[model samples]
Target chain A: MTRVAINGFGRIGRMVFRQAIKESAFEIVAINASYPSETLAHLIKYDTVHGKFDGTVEAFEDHLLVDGKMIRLLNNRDPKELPWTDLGVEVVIEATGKFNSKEKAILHVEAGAKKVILTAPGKNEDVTIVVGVNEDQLDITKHTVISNASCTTNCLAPVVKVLDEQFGIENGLMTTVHAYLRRARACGQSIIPTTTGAAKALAKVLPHLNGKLHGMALRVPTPNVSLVDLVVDVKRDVTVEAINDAFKTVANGALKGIVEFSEEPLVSIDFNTNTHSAIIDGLSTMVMGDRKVKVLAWYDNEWGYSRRVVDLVTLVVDELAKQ
Target chain B: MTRVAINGFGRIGRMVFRQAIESAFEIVAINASYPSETLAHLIKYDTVHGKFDGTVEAFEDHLLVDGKMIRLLNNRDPKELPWTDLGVEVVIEATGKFNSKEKAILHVEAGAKKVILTAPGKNEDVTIVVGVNEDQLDITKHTVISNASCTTNCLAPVVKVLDEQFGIENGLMTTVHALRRARACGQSIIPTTTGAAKALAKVLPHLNGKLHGMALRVPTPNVSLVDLVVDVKRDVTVEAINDAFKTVANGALKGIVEFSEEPLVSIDFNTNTHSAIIDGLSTMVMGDRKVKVLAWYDNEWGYSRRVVDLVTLVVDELA
Candidate 1:
């Protein structure tokens, strides 16, 4: 089994650990969180958004007892100071959000991890993979530092891929109405306006869309879950049925688990713990003038993107084995 | 000042009274389901829109607000209200229950000269968005009028500006509302129904089948946002759209349609009186033909202010 270590105990880091423990592809042997083991253990045990953890998580001396398994834990700010080499940490999941650039992420590899996968987009990484869109681009030997892009990109890229592939995409605009996190304004009250790199980041996974896409974000007062409203011009004249059916076909076929299709009038909370990166809302799909199309997608920004990060870890391990 | 009566002291009802206190409109009576003390307390201190602008005290039969005693009555039936005796020339039917022509005309039958439904009316004499279609309002014929819903009030002026300036091909509106009409309560972002676009078509006939809309009831308590995406007949730019709103915000649609370039959020629009505030920053134009406009409205306070404005219009025409 491939050995992995999570470098942060935030939302995405904890989600990755929970997902990694559920499967046998990768083993989380260590976690480098800045907080105490008790604090880390308590957060993993109880979550306000995703509900309580199903298994045991207790703080031991230098480790965490997660379901009776002793996982090594350390509080180190600098990656080079951590004992990754001795712990045989093959892959370091960079969830810190601080070490997002290739130069900063390389510290994990310098400290003796075989590779690093960033939970967010990078300044200059070997590759940025949106699981359903460009997971085939992952090469562990060539691409040491990888970016999972953003939650909005993860939700938008696949649906964009389908639209661009079936009918060529012209210029597009995206609005990701997201839930509030830590911000200057009160999260539970305002529909705060913010910026998103999703449209720009899409070019990383789908390079053909570099100058064709633009986006903005509105941080609404929900705890979790997000909505993506993508309006684009397609080369071919299209119908609402063609677009909806195209997503339905791909979601059931190639993009099976990564992209799901729903005709249900479900809202953000209904997709709370959804693992799919994008759930295309079939009913909300609209086409104007038979060329300009608008599609809506829903995603659990934390949980869904965390699942993709874990999947990317396994992809990296497979690519390394081939090399 | 025309003697007015506010029926149903809910959020909108209380807001109408609060707003009318500063205007020439005389709120002679208020009919509420709750006790006078509860109504007075609610008007004095609101959770979202804040306290009343002036002093308010509760009496057995009236609320003494700013040294004036506004009669407060409790009547389940609109016909039982003493509109004629109190010389209540007009009734603002804000109970959100009497939204039909037959039911709303009960205020007229009870001796008020006219009635305004705070919510959208079914087959009312006319539905008016103050700035958009108030010019079409016929005072002699329109005995019962609808001020339209808050969503409609926010979207109508926006649609009017876009269609008049650039000529709309088709449009879709998505409104983010504070949670209601759902069992999920404060737990989920509930997708509900909105008739804003359909209601707008009644006022602006050219957009009958060209406009569509839906609502997402979010977890907040007040202030709603509208995401209106439209494909226009004529090509346009972000500047052209924003400038058009700014021009109207200064001219014809001043006060009703506000245009702001400031970076604002939903909370900032709470208790704002504008029917629609075009967020200049959030305005986006796609492919030179499709334009997306983001507008904010204080669903409670904003709509009530419009109701008061409509009342003033109806009174002036009557005089």
Candidate 2:
């Protein structure tokens, strides 16, 4: 199995660690955080949104016994200070959300890992992949640092790419009804207006939309399951049936596991731990005058995005002939 | 002051009574589902909104609120209420059950001069929003009026400006509310249906088939938001949209519509009086023809205040 280490044992990192260990293609040997081992173990045992852990998790000194596996735990804030080579760590998943730029993210690679996958958009990395949109552009041997983009970008890019491919896009806008985080406000209390890099990140995944998209974010009172509301103008004349059927076709074929089409009338809660990056709401799809269209996509901000991070790791391992 | 009676002392009725006591009117009587003792406790202390600012004491016949005696009747039928004997001019029909025209007209048949529905009234003589279409009210012919729902009140004033200034070609609304039907909050982002989007046509006829929407019931306790995306005929900018609202907020729609430049959230407008607070910072212009606008509203408190304002308008016209 390919050896992997997690740099942050926080929300996304913990979920990725859970996912990596479950996959027989990978082995997680070391995890890093700035907290005591006991608290981290407790967090893994009981999660508020994703529910309790399915396996045993116990703390012992600087290591954790996670379902009969003794994993090394380190409390380091700087990635360069850790000993990644000694642990035979092939790659590191950077979930710290701080070391996103090229100068900071490359520290993990210089410390003796072969590749780094950031859980955020890269400032200047080798490539940014959104699973189904542009994963074919990734070169594991040469591209050392990669970004999985943000959750909204992962949810928006595939739907945008499909629409733009079937019937070219003119211009578009987005509104991500996000869960509460950051922005220096009281959570679970207010509907806040913030910024989103999704529209900008969408352009990176699909280069044809460089300066053509823009959007904003609103943090609602829910704890999970963020939604993306996109409205665009297509170059070709399209009907609601044509657009919905197009998404259903690609979602079941090429983008089978990564994108899904939800024909039923479901809400945000119905997609809590939905593995797909974008679950296109068929009932919410609307088109006016045969060209103007509106579509809604739902994604679990933490679980689904974390699963994609592991998917990127698997893709890299396959490229290196390690699987 | 006009002598008024409130029927169905639920969320909106209790709020209307509070706003009426402070305004230039008298709440002479209140008819509710529960006894005076239970109703007084509800009036004195509220859970979601705020505590009553005055005193409330219960009795068999009447209750004293803020040192004023009000007739309290628990009549299941509106005809049995002492509207004529107590000289009740306007009956505020706040009961959610008695919203249809047939049920609300019982107040007039039982001898109240007029009726006002806190909810959207079916077969209403007139549906008036304070700033948008309040001028449509003719007291001689309009016996029962609707103040519309809370969502409609917040949406109409902002849509009026967009339609009048930039000429809205079509629009879509997404209302994020605080609660939903029989579901526990803090659990899921529930999806529900709303008539406020369709109800816009009743208030502003220009936006008849051009608008439609659904609601996302979030977990917050109060304050709701409306995200309106519209394609307009004239080319517009973000600055143009915000500036138009700022002009309307300060001039003609001063008290009804408010414009805010400060960065605030939903809870900041908990007990706000404005029908809609135009979040100028959230104005986004997609291309030269399409735009998006966000507004916040205190549904219970703001809608109740508008209900009281309509009651005052009807009373003043009667004089």
Query: Where does model 2 exceed 4 Å of error?
Result: B1-319
Per-residue C-alpha lDDT of model 2 across residues B77-187, encoded as one tens digit per residue: 987777888898999988888888888888988889999989998998989988888888998999989999999999999899898899989989899997235343577
* B1-319: candidate 1 lDDT, tens digit per residue: 7898888977788788778875567887888877777777777876576666788777787778888878778778888878887898999987888888888888888889999898989989999988889988999888999998989999988899888889989988899987235133357677878999889778899888999989998778788989999999988999999999999988989998888899988888877899899899999999999999999988888898899899999988988
- The TM-score between candidate 1 and the true structure equals 0.52
Clashes of each: 0, 0
TM-score evaluated only on chain B, model 1 = 0.96
* lDDT string, candidate 2, A302-323, tens digits: 8888889989988887887742
Candidate 2, residue A21: Cα displacement in angstroms equals 1.5
DockQ of candidate 2 against the true complex: 0.07
True contacts kept of each: 0.09, 0.18
* Position A201, candidate 2: lDDT: 82
The ten-residue window of minimal lDDT in model 1 chain A covers A180-189
